[PDB]
Structures are given as C-alpha cells and as structure tokens.
C-alpha cells in the first residue's frame, strides 16, 4: 500500500546514473533476437509479450516487473529451446519470476495457471529458468533509467510523478515489439521520455531541447537518440490486443 517516494541517494547521485550505464554493459549483445530458436518466430514473441503485458497491467503490478519479465524471457531463450505449445508456460514463468523480484505482491501460480498447464508443471518451468540462467536473474531495465534521466536533464521534481507514470507506461508497451529488444536499456528509456514529453508538453521544454542533452548524458550520437525516439514511439503505436 505504501509507495517509494523520492530518495536523493538513489535518484540524484550522478554516480547512480553512472553505474546503470556500467551494469548495462553486463548483459551482452543479442546479435539477432531468438537466433537459437528452431521453431518459434519473433511473431510468436510479440503475441506472448502482449499476453504477458496485459497480465501485468491488469493485475496492476509495479512498472518494473514487465521489462524484467521480458529480459528474463529473452536471456532464457538462448540457453534453452522453446516451443509453440510451451511458450504460454515459459512466459507465465517469467512474469512469475519477475513479480517475485520486483514487486511486493507477486503474481501467484494459481493466478497464472488457472488463467492459461498444471501448476506443478509451471513450478518446474520456473526451476528450469532459474538454473538455466544460473539464478542470475536481475538486469538493468529500461525502466531503471527514468528518474536518473529526469534528474540528469534537470527536470523539476514536481513533474517526476506524472512523467514517471506516463513514460514507464509507454516504455512497457514499446518493449512488446521485436526491434526494441535490441536497443540498450538506457536508450529505450531516453526514447520513452521524449515521446511522452512530446504528447502533452507537460510544461517542460519541448522534445527537441532534450535530444542534444540525452546524447551527452548517455554518450550516443544525436542521430541515434532521434532514431530511438521514433523507434519507441512506433513500438507503442503497434500495441494491439486483437492479435491475441
């Protein structure tokens, strides 16, 4: 019931931003998403990712659960081979694992199975992800960068709550899409922010004005930044529950 309020230590310390970027360099580069796969396509992924998204959204889980569900799922689908009649399970086990870490009230098995395989059969599909990833579960989420970026960009604090709520919502959806899976979490975030800023100016400066800065903050070129915005702004638009 209580929520995490602003904490200068965790939010305004420049070296926090500094370490996100660093720990971003830990999970290495998917040269191509789901290459190891010899059955399920990326199309299957978009579908399972919107089911997993809907799950998180409708049960109102903390915003950082889904991105991490995605990250687990992906990491996991190199280490092992997935199937079509089995993805539902796997994705279900990612949300279940993600919820266990990043949210106080985690998605229960009975909640997850009943909606969707036996609950025994799901417990294994957890075990099997855990040991496959060798319990190294956590990850830098595109989410994690939101406030550290608002702070770095000198955005007034009273805007943080809305800005947070709004751009986390758009990042989360964007993540559903194939091509977004390849971008660095810092960038996905910078994109999320700018798109959001664009639609209802929120009484900041306008989108334009933050492009050169995020390029300085993150240490990419401006073109890269301008691109990732369009890219994430796209990913958002392509959300569609009918595909289910």
């Amino acid at each position: 019931l209580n929520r995490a309020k602003i904490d200068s230590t965790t939010m305004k310390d420049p070296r926090v931003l500094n370490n996100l970027k660093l720990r971003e360099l830990l999970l290495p580069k998917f040269t191509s998403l789901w290459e190891i796969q010899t059955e399920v396509t990326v199309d299957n992924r978009t579908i399972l990712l919107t089911w997993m998204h809907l799950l998180c959204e409708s049960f109102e889980l903390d915003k950082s659960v889904f991105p991490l569900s995605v990250s687990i799922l992906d990491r996991y689908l190199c280490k092992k081979q997935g199937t079509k009649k089995t993805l539902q399970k796997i994705g279900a086990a990612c949300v279940l694992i993600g919820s266990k870490i990043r949210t106080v009230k985690p998605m229960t098995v009975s909640k997850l199975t009943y909606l969707s395989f036996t609950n025994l059969e799901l417990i294994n599909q957890e075990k099997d992800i855990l040991e496959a990833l060798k319990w190294d579960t956590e990850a830098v989420l595109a989410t994690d960068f939101l406030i550290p970026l608002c702070n770095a960009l000198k955005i007034p604090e009273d805007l943080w709550p809305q800005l947070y709520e709004a751009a986390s919502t758009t990042i989360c959806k964007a993540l559903i899409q194939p091509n977004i899976a390849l971008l660095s979490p810092g960038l996905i975030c910078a994109g999320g922010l700018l798109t959001t800023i664009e639609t209802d100016n929120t009484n900041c400066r306008p989108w334009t004005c933050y492009l050169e800065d995020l390029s300085s903050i993150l240490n990419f070129s401006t073109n890269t930044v301008r691109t990732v915005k369009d890219q994430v702004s796209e990913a958002f638009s392509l959300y569609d529950l009918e595909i289910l």
Binding site: L1, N2, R3, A4, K5, I6, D7, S8, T9, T10, M11, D13, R15, V16, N19, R23, L26, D62, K63, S64, L96, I97, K100, I101, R102, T103, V104, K105, P106, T108, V109, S110, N119, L122, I123, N124, E126, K127, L130, E131, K134, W135, D136, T137, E138, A139, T143, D144, L146, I147, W160, P161, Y164, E165
Partner: protein, 282 residues
C-alpha cells in the same frame, strides 16, 4: 549434491538455517551453507530467496570487499519428496554479535570502532549506488573476518528501489527499525543508515541501544533519547549518557545517522566523508 559435510550451525537465516561446512574438491577450506526447505504447497521458489540470489549475483562482477560472496545454488528436485536447496557462500569467522561478546575488556579499541564503521559504511555506499537497499541491517548480519574485515550478509530482504514502487510496511528487526517504518510511513535507503546509527552506538556501548517490545514502545524508546522534533519533521536527553566513551566527532556522526526526519538523515557517501574518518586509511 555430495561435495560437503556440515559442522556447526552458524545461525537460523532467512527461511531456515545456515551451517558451517567444508568443501572437498576445493582446497579443503570453508563454505557457508544455507538450507532452504521449499514447502510443497504451491508458490514455487521462495520470493525472498530468488530475490536475494539475484542481487548478489548481479553485483558479483564488482567483487566488493565489504559484501558477502555466493558461490553456488545446488537445487536437487525430488519426485519422492519436496525440493530442498543448498545455497553456498563464503564462510566468515564470526558475526558482529559474537565478536562484541568475545572482545576483551575494555571492549573494542576506538580505532577498530572507527575502521569497522568505515568498512560498513563503505559497503553500504556501494549497495545504495546500485539502487539496492539492504533493509535488514543488524549486528547478526554484519560479519567480521579473521583479519577483522566487514561483510554485509543475509540479503533476503534487500531489493532494488524504484520510484513509486509498492512497499511492505514490515522491514528491519524491532531494535534497529527506523521511525519512518514504525510510523507506517514510506521509506528507502535512510533506513540502512538509521541501523548504522544504532550499530555505531552498540559498538561503544556493547549493548543494543533501542530495545523495544512493541512498535509503539520501540518508538518511545527512540524518542526518549533523540527527542520530539517539530511539525516540520513529522510526516530530549544528551546522547553521551547512553553512549559514554565516544569522541566529539563520533557523536556528530552518530546523531547525523540518528536523525528523525529521513530526508535530513546523513547519507553513506557524505557519512564516509564526515570528519570522524580522517584518521583512518588516510
């Protein structure tokens, strides 16, 4: 599964118990074994355990000197029974508790006091700068190696903090809880420093400072010492009484961690730089 043999039980941790044991395939040296009996109810691996490993794994490529190390997770699934877990860490000789209990008179040397404090804050700094709050900081969780080095242990209540995230109103053990938690308020990192305030003191006076029994009493106990603050700070008695044998700069630091308002309470980073510490590693 069969690389070990348990000796003494060095304490009942997060879910069950933690044993002292030796590794065989290695140099023959010591390993810390956490036994986790997963209830064949229906929730999968315990929340607390999954989280705690994930955080420790996540930071391990930093190899921070003031944090415990995890080597392995056994897992052996049983079709004849429930699962059981072997969680395997570096062994450390004793905790702060036993050490405070064993130390010759007249207690721990002030220069050790300063150093343990230092290391402790240092490990904390680290943890916070990676957005981890170790919200279960107590003498039993603080580990002292043979060379007298500090390791933060039991990460089963630690979690990565993000704005607007949901919180359990129920964190830290009674004695070392902060007013914000007691008041059922929202909380974060300053929580760890409150604990370090309490611990700092427990070092000089080899006895816990705030020994409550209810939350309400636990709060009064605190307020009996630190004093009632203003309307501003709500969302005495001179300390030296409760903490004799403390230096003037040790005091200022100690108050700075034991600030009622959290947003006023000092941070590890600024605490690491407080004038109490100049004398140390230099």
């Amino acid at each position: 599964d069969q690389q070990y043999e348990c000796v003494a039980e060095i304490g009942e941790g997060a879910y069950g118990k933690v044993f002292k044991a030796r590794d065989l395939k290695n140099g023959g040296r010591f390993v810390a074994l956490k036994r986790v009996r997963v209830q064949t109810g229906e929730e999968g691996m315990p929340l607390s355990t999954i989280r705690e490993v994930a955080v420790l794994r996540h930071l391990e490529t930093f190899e921070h000197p003031n944090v415990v190390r995890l080597f392995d997770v056994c897992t052996v699934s049983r079709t004849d029974r429930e699962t059981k877990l072997t969680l395997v860490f570096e062994h450390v000789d004793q905790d702060l508790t036993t050490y405070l209990d064993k130390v010759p008179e007249p207690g721990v040397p002030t220069e050790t006091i300063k150093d343990m404090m230092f290391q402790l804050l240092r490990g904390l700094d680290f943890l916070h700068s990676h957005r981890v709050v170790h919200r279960d900081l107590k003498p039993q969780n603080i580990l002292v190696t043979s060379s007298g080095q500090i390791k933060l242990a039991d990460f089963g209540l630690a979690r990565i903090y993000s704005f607007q995230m949901a919180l359990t109103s129920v964190v830290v053990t009674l004695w070392y809880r902060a007013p914000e938690v007691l008041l059922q308020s929202s909380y974060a990192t300053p929580v760890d420093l409150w604990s370090v305030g309490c611990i700092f003191a427990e070092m000089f006076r080899r006895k816990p400072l705030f020994r409550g029994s209810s939350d309400v009493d636990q709060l009064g106990k605190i307020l009996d010492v630190i004093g009632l603050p203003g309307e501003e700070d709500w969302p005495a008695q001179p300390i030296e009484k409760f903490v004799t044998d403390i230096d003037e700069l040790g005091k200022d630091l100690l108050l700075k961690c034991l600030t009622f308002n959290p947003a006023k309470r000092i941070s590890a980073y600024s605490a690491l730089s407080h004038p109490y510490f100049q004398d140390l590693e230099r």
